Amino acid sequence: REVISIHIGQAGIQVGNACWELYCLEHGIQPDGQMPSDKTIGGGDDAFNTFFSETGAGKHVPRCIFLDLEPTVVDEVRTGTYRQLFHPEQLISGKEDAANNFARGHYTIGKEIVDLALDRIRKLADNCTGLQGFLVFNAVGGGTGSGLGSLLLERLSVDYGKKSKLGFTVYPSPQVSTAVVEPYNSVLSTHSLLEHTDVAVMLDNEAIYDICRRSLDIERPTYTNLNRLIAQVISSLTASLRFDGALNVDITEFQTNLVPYPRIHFMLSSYAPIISAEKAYHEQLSVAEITNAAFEPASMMVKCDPRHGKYMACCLMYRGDVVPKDVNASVATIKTKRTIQFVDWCPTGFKCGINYQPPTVVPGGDLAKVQRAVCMISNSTAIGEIFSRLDHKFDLMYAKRAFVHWYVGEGMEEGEFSEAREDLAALEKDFEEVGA
Amino acid sequence: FQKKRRLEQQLEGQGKAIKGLTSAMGRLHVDLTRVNGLIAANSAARQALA
Amino acid sequence: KRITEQFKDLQSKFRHFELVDTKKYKEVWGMKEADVAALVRQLLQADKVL
């Protein structure tokens, strides 16, 4: 029972550097692709087969694909600690970067390396037997992760179709702007992904800086800090497929329990408890505490107010010591809570799940090892504010026909600009309609 | 804030009414059982007297 | 055959529900109006004494 992850671009490969660290660390795999003979942590030999397949005599290789156009970060991870871990062909990279342009990364340069990437993924999938689905991690605000990212989404969809698609994009944040021309490659990829990928769980940057400032006190945090808890939420949502528990939820449960309408699929993720070692034992963790922390707005991967929205559905993974009674009591308290509202046509909306294995702490991190940990993925209508702000800033530059000459010279025209504008407007309209 | 406080007060009023009604239901259920017992006893007495 | 017998059962149930609901509503109104009549009799007695 395997799930194949694709990492695209700078953000994809950095989140990969964090995740494929966390998974190997949890399964006890040495950074050389082996497992020590003398000491064996408690687990099932089938547990690690969801990620790290075996190649011959005691050799483990991950099921994944890093791909990028630049050679810089890819040969950096090559030079890094994980040298023999990744198969030398699980690392696909061009020689000239897309340089922050959807058109350049999707037509001119995006039409050479995608064939090799797709061939490699196809052979790896055919090696895999029980492919649960495809998970994508990328940044929508860049060139390498956006253009050929959407190209690969389309090509995977036309190749398999029947296998689930779960994306994890990094939208531009409201105020912190890493790049300048970001909204272009954001909206252009939104036009595609709104109807190609099945379920999208969104991420942000300020929405995580604030968390690691308040609950972690790292006043000067960075991507190396954020990516670790990103890996943590990914692991805490795949834990049910990976390990064994009491109330399992496979990769189909998320889509079956959280996507009412085919064109209403956008998820807000949240993780509790985010706490450092200093407060870990000075505070008393419990199911009620962690659930209330998860459902307060300030502990969300996406900078948005759910109090301007109405929750449509939620999925709660739990790890470690979790009795299926305290979770029920806490979620009943949440339903009774006087702040978060529900859309009138969803009486039951809390898909829970439990796993025995508690979270694993990476050494040198800020998160402390804790008995339990939750992970809340919710389909809610408050996300429409994100796209509304995106359009409200997109038109300001689109009207002036500024920064468009790069795309038009590469070959695309303003017709698809207007198409993306109109379709994201329709998406906002659709959220407004479902809010009824 | 005035509106919120007033709505709260109405909420506790309704809760108190609910609890009182439940207490009355319990009392009436007990009286149901007692009355049915008396029915049975007097039926036996009627047969004996006949 | 299933839907025919279901039709017949539906007709019988319709008649039964009509009779039961009408009888119940009539009886409960009669009982509670007798109760309020007793209460107003008590009020009149109190007023006369005062």
Binding site: - | - | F14, F17, T22, K32, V36, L43, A46, D47, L50
Partner: protein, 52 residues
């Protein structure tokens, strides 16, 4: 079945409105009676110190 549901709903609504209005009226009447009986009790207690 539509006729079924419509008729039963109508009966339920009429029972609802009857019960609610009747309960309100009884509460008002009981309040009046409680005031009256408090008055009578005060009169009863007061006439104890009255001389013959």
């Amino acid at each position: 079945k539509s006729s079924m549901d419509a008729f039963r709903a109508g009966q339920a609504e009429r029972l609802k409105q009857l019960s609610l209005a009747s309960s309100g009226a009884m509460e008002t009447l009981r309040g009046k009676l409680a005031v009256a009986e408090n008055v009578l009790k005060l009169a009863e207690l007061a006439r104890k110190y009255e001389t013959e």
